[PDB]
Amino acid sequence: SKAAEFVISKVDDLMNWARTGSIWPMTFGLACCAVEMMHTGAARYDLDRFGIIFRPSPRQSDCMIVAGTLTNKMAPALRKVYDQMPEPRWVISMGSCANGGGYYHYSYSVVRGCDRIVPVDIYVPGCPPTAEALLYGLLQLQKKINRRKDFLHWWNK
Amino acid sequence: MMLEFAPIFIYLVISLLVSLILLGVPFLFSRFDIRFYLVSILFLIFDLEVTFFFPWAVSLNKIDLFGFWSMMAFLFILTIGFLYEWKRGALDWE
Amino acid sequence: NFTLNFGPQHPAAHGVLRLVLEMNGEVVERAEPHIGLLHRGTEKLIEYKTYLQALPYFDRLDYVSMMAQEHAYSLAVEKLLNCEVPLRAQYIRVLFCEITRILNHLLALTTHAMDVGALTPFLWAFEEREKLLEFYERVSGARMHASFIRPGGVAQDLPLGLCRDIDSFTQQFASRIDELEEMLTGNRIWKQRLVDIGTVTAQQAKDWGFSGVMLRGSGVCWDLRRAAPYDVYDQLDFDVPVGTRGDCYDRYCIRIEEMRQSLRIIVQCLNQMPSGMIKADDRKLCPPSRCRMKLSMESLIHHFELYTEGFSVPASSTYTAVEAPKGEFGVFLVSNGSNRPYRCKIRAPGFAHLQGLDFMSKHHMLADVVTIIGTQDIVFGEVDR
Amino acid sequence: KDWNTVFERSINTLFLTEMVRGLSLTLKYFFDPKVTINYPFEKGPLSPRFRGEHALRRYPTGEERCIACKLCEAVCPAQAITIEAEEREDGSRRTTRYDIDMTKCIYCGFCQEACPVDAIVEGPNFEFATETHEELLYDKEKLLENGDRWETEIAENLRSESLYR
Amino acid sequence: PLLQDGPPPGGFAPVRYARRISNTGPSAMAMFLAVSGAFAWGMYQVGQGNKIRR
Amino acid sequence: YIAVPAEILGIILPLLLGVAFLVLAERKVMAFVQRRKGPDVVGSFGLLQPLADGLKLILKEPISPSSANFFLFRMAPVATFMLSLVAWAVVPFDYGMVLSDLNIGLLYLFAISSLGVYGIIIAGRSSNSKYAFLGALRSAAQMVSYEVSIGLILITVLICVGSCNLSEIVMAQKQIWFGIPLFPVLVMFFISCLAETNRAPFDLPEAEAELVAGYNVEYSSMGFALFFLGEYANMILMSGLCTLFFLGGWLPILDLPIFKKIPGSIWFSIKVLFFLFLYIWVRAAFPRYRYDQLMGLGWKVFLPLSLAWVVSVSGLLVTFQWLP
Amino acid sequence: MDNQFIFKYSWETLPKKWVKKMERSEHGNRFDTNTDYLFQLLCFLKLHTYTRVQVLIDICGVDYPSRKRRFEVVYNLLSTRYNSRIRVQTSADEVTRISSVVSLFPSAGWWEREVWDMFGVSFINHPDLRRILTDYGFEGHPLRKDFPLSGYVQVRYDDPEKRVVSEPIEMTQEFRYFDFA
Amino acid sequence: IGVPPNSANLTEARRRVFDFFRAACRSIPTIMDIYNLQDVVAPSQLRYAISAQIRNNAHITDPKVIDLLIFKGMEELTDIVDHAKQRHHIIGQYVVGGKTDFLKNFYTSNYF
Amino acid sequence: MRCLPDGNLLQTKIHNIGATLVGVDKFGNKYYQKLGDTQYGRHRWVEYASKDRYNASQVPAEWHGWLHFITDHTGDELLS
Amino acid sequence: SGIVATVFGATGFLGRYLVQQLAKMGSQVLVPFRGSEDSPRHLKLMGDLGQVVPMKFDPRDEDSIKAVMAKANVVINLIGREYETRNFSFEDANHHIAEKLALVAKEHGGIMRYIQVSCLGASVSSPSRMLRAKAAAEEAVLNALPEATIMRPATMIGTEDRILNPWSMFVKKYGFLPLIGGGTTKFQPVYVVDVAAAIVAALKDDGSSMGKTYELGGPDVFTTHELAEIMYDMIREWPRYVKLPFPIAKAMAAPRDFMVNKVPFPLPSPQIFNLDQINALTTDTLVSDNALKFQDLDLVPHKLKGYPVEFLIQYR
Numbered sequence A: 001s002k003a004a005e006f007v008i009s010k011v012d013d014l015m016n017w018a019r020t021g022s023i024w025p026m027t028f029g030l031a032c033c034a035v036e037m038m039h040t041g042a043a044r045y046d047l048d049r050f051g052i053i054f055r056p057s058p059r060q061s062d063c064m065i066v067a068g069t070l071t072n073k074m075a076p077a078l079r080k081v082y083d084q085m086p087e088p089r090w091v092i093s094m095g096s097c098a099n100g101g102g103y104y105h106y107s108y109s110v111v112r113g114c115d116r117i118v119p120v121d122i123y124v125p126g127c128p129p130t131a132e133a134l135l136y137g138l139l140q141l142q143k144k145i146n147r148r149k150d151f152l153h154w155w156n157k
Numbered sequence B: 001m002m003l004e005f006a007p008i009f010i011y012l013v014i015s016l017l018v019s020l021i022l023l024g025v026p027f028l029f030s031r032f033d034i035r036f037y038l039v040s041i042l043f044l045i046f047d048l049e050v051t052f053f054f055p056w057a058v059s060l061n062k063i064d065l066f067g068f069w070s071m072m073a074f075l076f077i078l079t080i081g082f083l084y085e086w087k088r089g090a091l092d093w094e
Numbered sequence C: 001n002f003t004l005n006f007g008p009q010h011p012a013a014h015g016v017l018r019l020v021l022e023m024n025g026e027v028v029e030r031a032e033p034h035i036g037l038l039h040r041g042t043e044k045l046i047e048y049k050t051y052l053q054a055l056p057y058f059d060r061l062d063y064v065s066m067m068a069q070e071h072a073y074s075l076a077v078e079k080l081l082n083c084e085v086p087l088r089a090q091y092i093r094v095l096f097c098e099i100t101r102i103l104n105h106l107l108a109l110t111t112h113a114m115d116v117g118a119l120t121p122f123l124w125a126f127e128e129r130e131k132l133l134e135f136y137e138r139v140s141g142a143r144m145h146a147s148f149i150r151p152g153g154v155a156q157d158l159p160l161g162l163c164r165d166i167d168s169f170t171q172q173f174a175s176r177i178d179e180l181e182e183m184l185t186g187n188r189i190w191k192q193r194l195v196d197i198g199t200v201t202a203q204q205a206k207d208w209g210f211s212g213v214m215l216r217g218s219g220v221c222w223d224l225r226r227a228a229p230y231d232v233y234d235q236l237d238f239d240v241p242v243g244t245r246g247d248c249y250d251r252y253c254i255r256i257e258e259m260r261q262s263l264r265i266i267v268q269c270l271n272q273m274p275s276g277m278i279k280a281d282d283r284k285l286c287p288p289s290r291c292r293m294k295l296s297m298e299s300l301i302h303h304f305e306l307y308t309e310g311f312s313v314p315a316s317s318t319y320t321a322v323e324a325p326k327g328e329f330g331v332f333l334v335s336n337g338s339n340r341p342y343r344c345k346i347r348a349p350g351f352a353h354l355q356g357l358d359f360m361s362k363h364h365m366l367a368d369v370v371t372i373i374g375t376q377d378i379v380f381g382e383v384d385r
Numbered sequence D: 001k002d003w004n005t006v007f008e009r010s011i012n013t014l015f016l017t018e019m020v021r022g023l024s025l026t027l028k029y030f031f032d033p034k035v036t037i038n039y040p041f042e043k044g045p046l047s048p049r050f051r052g053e054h055a056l057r058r059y060p061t062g063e064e065r066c067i068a069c070k071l072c073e074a075v076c077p078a079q080a081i082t083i084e085a086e087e088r089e090d091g092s093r094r095t096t097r098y099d100i101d102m103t104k105c106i107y108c109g110f111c112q113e114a115c116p117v118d119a120i121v122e123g124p125n126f127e128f129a130t131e132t133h134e135e136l137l138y139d140k141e142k143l144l145e146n147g148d149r150w151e152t153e154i155a156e157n158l159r160s161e162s163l164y165r
Numbered sequence E: 001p002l003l004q005d006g007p008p009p010g011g012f013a014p015v016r017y018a019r020r021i022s023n024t025g026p027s028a029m030a031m032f033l034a035v036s037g038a039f040a041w042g043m044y045q046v047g048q049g050n051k052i053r054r
Numbered sequence F: 001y002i003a004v005p006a007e008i009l010g011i012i013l014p015l016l017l018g019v020a021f022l023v024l025a026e027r028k029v030m031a032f033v034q035r036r037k038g039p040d041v042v043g044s045f046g047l048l049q050p051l052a053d054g055l056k057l058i059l060k061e062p063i064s065p066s067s068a069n070f071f072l073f074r075m076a077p078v079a080t081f082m083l084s085l086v087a088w089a090v091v092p093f094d095y096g097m098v099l100s101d102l103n104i105g106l107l108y109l110f111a112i113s114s115l116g117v118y119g120i121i122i123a124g125r126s127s128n129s130k131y132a133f134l135g136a137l138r139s140a141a142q143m144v145s146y147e148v149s150i151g152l153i154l155i156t157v158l159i160c161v162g163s164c165n166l167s168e169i170v171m172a173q174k175q176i177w178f179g180i181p182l183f184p185v186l187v188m189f190f191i192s193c194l195a196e197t198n199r200a201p202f203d204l205p206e207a208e209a210e211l212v213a214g215y216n217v218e219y220s221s222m223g224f225a226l227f228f229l230g231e232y233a234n235m236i237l238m239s240g241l242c243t244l245f246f247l248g249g250w251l252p253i254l255d256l257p258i259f260k261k262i263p264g265s266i267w268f269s270i271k272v273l274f275f276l277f278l279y280i281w282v283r284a285a286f287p288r289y290r291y292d293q294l295m296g297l298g299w300k301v302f303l304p305l306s307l308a309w310v311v312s313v314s315g316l317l318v319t320f321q322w323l324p
Numbered sequence G: 001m002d003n004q005f006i007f008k009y010s011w012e013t014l015p016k017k018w019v020k021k022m023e024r025s026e027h028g029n030r031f032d033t034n035t036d037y038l039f040q041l042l043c044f045l046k047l048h049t050y051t052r053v054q055v056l057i058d059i060c061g062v063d064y065p066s067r068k069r070r071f072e073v074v075y076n077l078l079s080t081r082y083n084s085r086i087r088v089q090t091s092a093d094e095v096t097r098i099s100s101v102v103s104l105f106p107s108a109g110w111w112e113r114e115v116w117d118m119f120g121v122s123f124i125n126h127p128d129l130r131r132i133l134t135d136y137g138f139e140g141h142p143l144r145k146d147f148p149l150s151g152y153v154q155v156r157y158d159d160p161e162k163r164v165v166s167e168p169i170e171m172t173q174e175f176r177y178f179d180f181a
Numbered sequence H: 001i002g003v004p005p006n007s008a009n010l011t012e013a014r015r016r017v018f019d020f021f022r023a024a025c026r027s028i029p030t031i032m033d034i035y036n037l038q039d040v041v042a043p044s045q046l047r048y049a050i051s052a053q054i055r056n057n058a059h060i061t062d063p064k065v066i067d068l069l070i071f072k073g074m075e076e077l078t079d080i081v082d083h084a085k086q087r088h089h090i091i092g093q094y095v096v097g098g099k100t101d102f103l104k105n106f107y108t109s110n111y112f
Numbered sequence I: 001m002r003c004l005p006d007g008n009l010l011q012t013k014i015h016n017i018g019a020t021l022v023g024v025d026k027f028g029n030k031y032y033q034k035l036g037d038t039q040y041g042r043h044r045w046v047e048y049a050s051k052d053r054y055n056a057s058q059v060p061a062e063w064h065g066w067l068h069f070i071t072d073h074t075g076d077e078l079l080s
Numbered sequence J: 001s002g003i004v005a006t007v008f009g010a011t012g013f014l015g016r017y018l019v020q021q022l023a024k025m026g027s028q029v030l031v032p033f034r035g036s037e038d039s040p041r042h043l044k045l046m047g048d049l050g051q052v053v054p055m056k057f058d059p060r061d062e063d064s065i066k067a068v069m070a071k072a073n074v075v076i077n078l079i080g081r082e083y084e085t086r087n088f089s090f091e092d093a094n095h096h097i098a099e100k101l102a103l104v105a106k107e108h109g110g111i112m113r114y115i116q117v118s119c120l121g122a123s124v125s126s127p128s129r130m131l132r133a134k135a136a137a138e139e140a141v142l143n144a145l146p147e148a149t150i151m152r153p154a155t156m157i158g159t160e161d162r163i164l165n166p167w168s169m170f171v172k173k174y175g176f177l178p179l180i181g182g183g184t185t186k187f188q189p190v191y192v193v194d195v196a197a198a199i200v201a202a203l204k205d206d207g208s209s210m211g212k213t214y215e216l217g218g219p220d221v222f223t224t225h226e227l228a229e230i231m232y233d234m235i236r237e238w239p240r241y242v243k244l245p246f247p248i249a250k251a252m253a254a255p256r257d258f259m260v261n262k263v264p265f266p267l268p269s270p271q272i273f274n275l276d277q278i279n280a281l282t283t284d285t286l287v288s289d290n291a292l293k294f295q296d297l298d299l300v301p302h303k304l305k306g307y308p309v310e311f312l313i314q315y316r
Ligand SMILES: NC(=O)C1=CN([C@@H]2O[C@H](COP(=O)(O)OP(=O)(O)OC[C@H]3O[C@@H](n4cnc5c(N)ncnc54)[C@H](OP(=O)(O)O)[C@@H]3O)[C@@H](O)[C@H]2O)C=CC1
Pocket: J008, J009, J010, J011, J012, J013, J014, J015, J033, J034, J035, J039, J059, J078, J079, J080, J081, J082, J088, J092, J093, J097, J117, J118, J119, J120, J152, J153, J154, J155, J156, J162
């Protein structure tokens, strides 16, 4: 297996290159964090230049950015949309509200962090995080995706 | 000669193969709206009009004035029908 | 009649907008909005905060018009305390209120345009928004939730050179509006999407509690900056644009003209800006300077009290309203003599405006619903609180 | 009204003239320079007042600045700060626990304003996204690490901002 | 200290806020005549090309 | 016939590369209009962005929802993609550069355009979504509505040429390009192509923010990719048709030896590129009509004017005996 | 049309049994009415030539647990015709229904729904009276003083049931009340 | 449609109680299909649950308290039908489908 | 060779043409400025030492303020 | 509770229900996973912040095994496979790992409770190779740890089960459901949540579970035909039972078993036609009257009808 491992590593690297260079997030803009994310997709920061294209349907989406406060009323709608994303999928939590409840943590109507509803891959801190802070968080998502060995793990299974 | 249609058939076969390859590789790793019927009716009428224009357009050089005016009468009948459509609100989707 | 359920869980239309529409074909018969998807219990939470700790909550109500709600809360507290605000703070507060109005109108006009298929103006406008957000950050250190306007004045003085940078922005912004207008105003597609859509009569606007552009579109000359002026608005020149048809097209033109008049106010504020203190000097609600707190016993005691207990507000109740970018923003504040508000009711213009969607969208097409929502300029942070 | 002005609008409608200007002005920015920042090689501008990642500071001798007054804890609008304290072996009033929930925090800067000894500050760092919720529960040692890393920039901003506060 | 951010002596330069006009565009008749003449001359050219093709 | 599949692949594969790079070109042009950069990180100047996006879609898991029409759901993107591909078998790029020299090529192209509607309608009903179905119905109605004007414009060109052979249609423009005497007809044709391709200002399937769900909302992975590739291949084809019928195809601008030096394939490619630029420039310039407004335009403006131009051109040609 | 005129004019022209209390102050003119006269008083203010109170700005409740009628319903109103504001208030308890003014001001519809949701005050003749802000199936009226800040239940996703479910609250760090009095 | 005035007397209030009982209990077959309770509980067991809630308040004599209870009952019913939050063994507030009580509590915890 | 797959790095190399080297930090990151006026006179950038696996967090504190235009002092002057 | 549990094989079907119930008790749960970091992702939602910790490990490496066990006082083993891969045989996945885990648990010394989850029918004289290897692991873990506890659940029914889901998928694709033994084999399927509850109860007892083996079956005994009837009324589809005697059932299940250890690439997993499970269908598998049932654990199983078969709604 001195030659299979080299080939497998190249296959996984090719798959990771495709997945990092083509991330199509579906925006879950619940509150003020959505406006900073709007700016990240604008001319100054141009998320399109990184290959990021925003999708309206979870069916064409690879990532979900939860940007804003999640209420108990909205929580089931968030879970349903996440369940319609096809694999592989990632979730980014943006802002204090989505991270752990933020300013509204002790409220009777607010979910104390979106990670109680969906698994979260990256937490972006701030209230709101700056547009550049979101861009850094997306680059951290690329770093985690670059650690995947999906072909190798499937080959040894 | 129909000889130029064989490459089209081979082209269709190859395009189908490419489509099947592309679509198969990932498997490895109670309300009736009458206006749609109406738009279908109008499309059918004008599609037949385009059909009768093709022989006429390629044949204008030999039918001369008679064929021109016979087509004009055909269009006149169909345009009376179209005006009836217009006035009855079939062309308005509001 | 079938029911079309439309919830865009993405900021194409507000992110948490949820509409149940009863349709006869493609014509809307009834539009029922379902809200509370962003209800966060702000009014309950405020009762557990000191008057200072409650201030950041107002930034997050209409999160496109942050400093405007800061201003309304500070004015209400100042009203109950009978606190004199120095003149320099008044000019700064008005200056950033008008900057906030442009920031709001730029987002409201181009997100609406983007929803009806005009994608370029949003990019051109958000670049101008970035220049204005830079002024937010230079005075407060925060791009959006500045918490800069406070009872008795403003948190800090302007950094050196900021006024010159603001003036540079004003020298070119009229061309930016001109470009926005040329992409939209004369275009026959834009007119066909907006003209005679969502017509509101003056009586209907009054009946449904409409305010701001929603009320002035219907020909009613009503602007709180002139009807009930505050800060230095009575010393400034600006015109109040009014509509003649009450349709989505009028309200589009009014927001463009309001941006031009906002530019006019900023220029006057820049030239009339006087020197002096930017905090009120009553040593009861104003934090002392870092140097005196570390040198004078009386200042250290005052600093200890203000950041632990806060200031008390004598028992009373009043309603205070300002001309926010989206309309009349009001606060009904009840005090019981303690350092925490007993009751803080927030009057959001979008609450009244979104309630008017049913009569505004009657007998229109499905594609006009988004246009009418865009002309109402809804942000659900203030609707739901 | 008049055959000329009737002809004027008929031609303007048929020939789509007003859509010509829309095309013309859309093309002018095409050949112009772009405003996009080449992140992460290039960064957006920020001010010395920027409210970012929290940090605990020390005196130049190495002693902590914080004296466990708990003013920052009392003023924090999000209740993101938890403090425990007792007298140190040398008699000093020092914290034994200083926690900031970065997921409750609203980055308001009120804690920095309340601190009487300039111990807690919001630094200029804004790039600290994490893969776990746990890493955003900052403890005292993490905050003092942040202050050690960012001390030279923080001290410079404090000198520049001292003339305003 | 005693130095605060504000206007320069004399104030800043005046700025325009009103919309600026722009008179760019041909005339109803000019573009009509162009289209009509192009049509007439071009269809004559079509006839000539059809004769040579024959 | 053993060499025919080589020619077929030499047509198809560069067409797929061209589509993949048309999507990149549209993103780059819209961005440059908007003072931004567009894809520029994945490869030098973003040139590897199409490869990454296609490879991403290939690796994405296919959902294939729990519908009762699983075969039709998957066959719908294959139908529209095959139809988009097969139109290029009769397109000439230069004198003798064409796979099938069909004598009925014009009517064959009309037939392909008429067939295109089925992928969209089948996607809507097979997707088990009321929102996808009503969007597919609207899109299908718009396409058939603008097919009438496209056909009438084709008849006008046919009267000028008197033959359904595309190469003969090009060679009939040696004396003068048809776009000069038929400029309004060319404008109408370009707008009818925009509406027929579901392109801005007529892009109902992109009007999700308008509460108007597209026909392909329930599609993921390569079914969605096939729909997208079909639409962009159709955009390239419509640019080619605008070039062939009105801009002289592979012919040079002036019949001079200086122009005759560069190959006619380069002329044809340049003209196609100019129309592909217009498709993007228009997408970047204007907002979109409502469905009722564009349907009104199709039946009340473009059909009457197309019929009028057929009558006028035929009458003038038979009057002065200038017929082919 | 200043606050002095309205106070003096209203005393002369209004029916005496309608108003129990009248306050003139810089914090706002304020009429305190009985529950059974609230509707008629607001109709008078809206229709009368010398008042023309055409805009209902908002309706809000206030909780006073020490009072036998704990709730106070506050009506904030505006006259654009005369550029003046007026406040009308009335008291209520947890079981007394009060008249709805939707027929007078259509904007009252949602505000009365919010008062019911937040406080539990019901409104006679309200066309569609249901909760508007809280989650579906909510128990309690959160703006009441006795209602706990964090409420009674919280939500989370439960994998075995494959859904979001509601459970009684369990806080990692309880809300710390700081008594600075 | 609209919210009615408060019931004048106990005859009016009890009449309103029966209309609510009829309306709430008539919706059991809708509730059975919504929560898929066919193999979980019989319709009669949920009918007896509603009746039991009404009987547990049979001692109320103030008609205004009865009116408020019915209004809250209609709202509870509407949320169960219109916006169902399906758990397994509950609908809304109601569970569906040799030592005294001191030792059991004592073994559990010190807080009773 | 990194220019071919990494277009982000290529943009920096193109824009580095004609720039002035300001300083180098302890990690080897190189700091450049242009002294023009194209994005409102903001012409400061960093060429990271690692041509692959570069990260925004690799900029030390002494150069962070210069890079974000917070201060006009370079990293060298702050360290002195 | 102060229980720190290292649950091996928790990224499978039973794992998610076991981790949820262990999280409810307050226990800290360590989740070893051997492949992608995505496999344990759904488990991070369970439990409060930091209570569930996935940890990469290697089955064929003892340094990694003791790394994930080094902080635990409870070890639960759910590792096993009903089919054969070219890299892991039935003895490799069902016996070698289980015996290896106990020896490292013995080397640890701090393991108060050890539970090995086997299968009902795990016997030496079993036609199926997998059950034979399970019984070997039954004896091996008992010999390595006589204080350990064993569970023997029957076919588990749940959302992610491999009996009702493969049949329903097979029906919606071919229109008919095969019966391998004429629909005559008897067995008593058990709700998966009940199996998870039993493991929790054994961890929660005063120590009476240690050293004992529990046969956990459903409340009622079906035949395969009768179970196939439940889903038909659930998936609201017309019943089309096509019989299939055992010879030909072993015919179409022969290839994958034949060519698993010869080809150098992976193969799709068998659903209905798994030669090993087909062999186990020859004889009825039931809870013995002399063993320890759900009673003596003070738990009552759920009936299959209703909630345990609610996941079949998605197939209508
Ligand atoms: N019907 C049933 O499901 C019944 C099952 N049982 C037994 O109970 C146990 C748990 O059942 P269930 O959860 O359904 O099983 P699954 O097959 O669904 O899950 C098995 C688990 O073990 C892991 N695993 C499997 N093979 C290996 C290997 N070779 N090396 C390392 N890890 C491995 C898997 O990890 P990964 O996902 O990474 O492969 C997974 O976490 C098994 O031993 C099973 O045989 C008992 C009776 C009936």
